[PDB]
Structure formats: structure tokens, C-alpha cells
Symmetry: C4
């Protein structure tokens, strides 16, 4: 469980650094600093307004933004589910 939880933290910090660099200047409310980026990527992970609210407005400036966000979703959504199931099975 600890290895999976540490993997997600490292992935979350690398992604939030990457997103600050890529979309910070063009989208400062969502990715203007590391803290705004970490909060936004958490929102993207929970799936909340990920496309209509964040990704589509971003893609109008950065067409390839889907190469960042879609894999981020596919990985974090799998890892979180694997972490929760892992913690539940270990507690049993």
C-alpha cells in the first residue's frame, strides 16, 4: 500500500510541475503556481469538469493538451482505485 501511495505522490508532483510550466502563463488561475496546479490536477483526477471546465478551454490554446491530461486521468484513476482496493484487502 505504501509503495502505491508513494508512486502517486511522485507522479502528482511531477505532473503539477509539468502543468505549471506548460499552461501557467496562458491559464494562470488553474496552473499559475505549483499549489494551483496540484489542486487542479486533483480536480481532474476526481473527474470534476475536467473536459468542459479545464481541458477544452486549454486545448483552444494548446491543441495537444490531451496527450498530457488523458494519460494523467488513465494512470491516477487506475492508481487511486488500486490504492483503495489494496488498503481494503490488507485491512481484511
Amino acid at each position: 500500500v505504501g509503495s502505491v501511495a508513494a508512486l502517486l505522490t511522485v507522479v502528482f508532483y511531477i505532473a503539477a510541475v509539468m502543468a505549471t510550466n506548460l499552461y501557467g502563463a496562458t491559464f494562470p488561475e488553474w496552473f499559475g503556481d505549483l499549489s494551483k496546479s496540484l489542486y487542479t490536477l486533483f480536480q481532474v483526477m476526481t473527474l470534476e469538469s475536467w473536459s468542459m471546465g479545464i481541458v477544452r478551454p486549454v486545448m483552444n490554446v494548446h491543441p495537444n493538451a490531451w496527450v498530457f491530461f488523458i494519460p494523467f486521468i488513465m494512470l491516477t484513476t487506475f492508481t487511486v482505485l488500486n490504492l483503495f482496493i489494496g488498503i481494503i484487502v490488507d485491512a481484511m
Copy 2:
């Protein structure tokens, strides 16, 4: 199953009291009384418009609001999933 269901009820009432106190005055439609608070925190748990609809408007007045909401989500989303899986396994 009963212990997990009781844990969530106690956590839900403490959070909705806390939210009434913190955000009630500045956001009365969402946290103006305990009943509005319990409804909103349920909506936050289901992930529905949690960030674009509630948390981002709140953070514009209370910058640290994420310290309340993010852990609330992480805990309730884990507990509910643990309660549903627990009820399914016990029925088998």
C-alpha cells in the same frame, strides 16, 4: 458494516456543523444552516460540481478552504466505497 456506517454519519454531521460555521455567512445558499450544509457535503461526496460549482467560488473568499474539502473528499469517497464493498462481501 454497522461500525463503518456509524463512522460516516458522525463524520458527516461534524463536517456539516464545521462548514455551517466557516462558510455559512459568506455562502448562505450552500452552508447557511445545517440542512443546506448536509445536502452540499453529500453533493461534494458524489463529486458533482465540487470544484467549479462550490470549492473555487468558496476559495476566492477563504483561500485555505481546500484543507477542509480535499480531506473530506478523500475520507468520504474511501469510506463509502469501503461500506458498499463491505455490504456486498457480507451478503455473499
Copy 3:
């Protein structure tokens, strides 16, 4: 699996009849006929805009609407998850 799938169909039709009757006149686009109601309740089940998009506008006319929708969500979200897990385990 068949018993769970039949339980959800009966619950979905009873709810969609109830919602047509209760909210049809005041909210015709969402519950004006049985077909619009069945579609809306499916959207409510997937959690999509359930509160900001449907339930909050409804509650402004019908304050108690949460007594219908919250249990509907709690039941269908549990049943669907139980049906999917049940179908997966039976296939193994």
C-alpha cells in the same frame, strides 16, 4: 445477476413514474413525460449535474425534492455497483 437487474428495472420505472407526477408540470424538459423522466433519472444515477443542473433548480420550487433524489442515488449507485461486481464474479 438476473434478480438484481430486474430489481433495478422495477425501481427505475416506479421512480420515473413518480418523478413525472411530482415535477412534470413545474420542470417539463426534465420530467414532462415518462421518457424524459427515465433519461433524467439515468443522468442522476451517473451523477452528471445531479445537484447544480437538476436537484437545486427543482428544490427552489419543491423544497423536499432531496427526500426523492438522495435515496434514489444511494439505492441505484449501490445496486449498479452490486450488479457490475456480481456479473464480473459470475464470469470468473
Copy 4:
């Protein structure tokens, strides 16, 4: 796991071709080409704004659009969950 992952890829490409053909002319931002279609159908799968954001605007032009989208959701949401659970069990 490989058979389930290949089934989803074939289903995703057939659906995105079908959606390009059906809704491309009337809704070009969402289904104007295969690339836009594949992105939108992924967003529909994650449940993000599927009804208020995409399906309801589409249904105002194509009333039967629900015959495409509802089964697409029911199938992909089941398959993805079956793929993730399958990958987790195989890793154990």
C-alpha cells in the same frame, strides 16, 4: 486483460466513426472529425458533462441520440471497470 483492452479499442474506434458520421455536421466542435469524436467519447465515458454539456444539446437536433450514448456509457463504464479489476486481480 489483453482481450478486454482490445475489445474496448475496437468498440471505441467504431463508436467514434459512427458519431463522426451522425453528429459531425450538426455538432462540429464535438464530432467534426475522428480525433474530436474519440476525445468526446472518452469524456462521455468518464461521465463528465455527458448529458448537460453534450447529449441534451445533441438530442435537440437528433431526438434518438440516447439510443447511441446510453448503451455506449453502459458498455464502456462496465468494460473499463472490468479491465481495471481484471488487471488488479492478475497482479495479486
